[PDB]
Amino acid sequence: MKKYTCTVCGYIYNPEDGDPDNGVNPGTDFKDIPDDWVCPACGVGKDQFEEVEE
Ligand SMILES: [Fe+2]
């Protein structure tokens, strides 16, 4: 799975770690994260994230 970054603050969503405190378990692909989730560091919506191509 690929990492995704918040294009507003730079936070990186890493699918191997998820965002468990906000209900996203490790191993969740960004696309499957419920669409009302927001960046844990600045609060903007998932629509401000972009795939990090490796
Ligand atoms: Fe952010």
Curated annotation (Swiss-Prot):
Gene3D superfamilies tied to this protein: 2.20.28.10
Cofactor: Fe(3+)
Tree of life domain: Bacteria
Ranges where the Rubredoxin-like domain occurs: 1-54
SUPFAM superfamilies the record matches: Rubredoxin-like
List of residues binding Fe cation: C6, C9, C39, C42
Function: Rubredoxin is a small nonheme, iron protein lacking acid-labile sulfide. Its single Fe, chelated to 4 Cys, functions as an electron acceptor and may also stabilize the conformation of the molecule.
Official protein name in the record: Rubredoxin
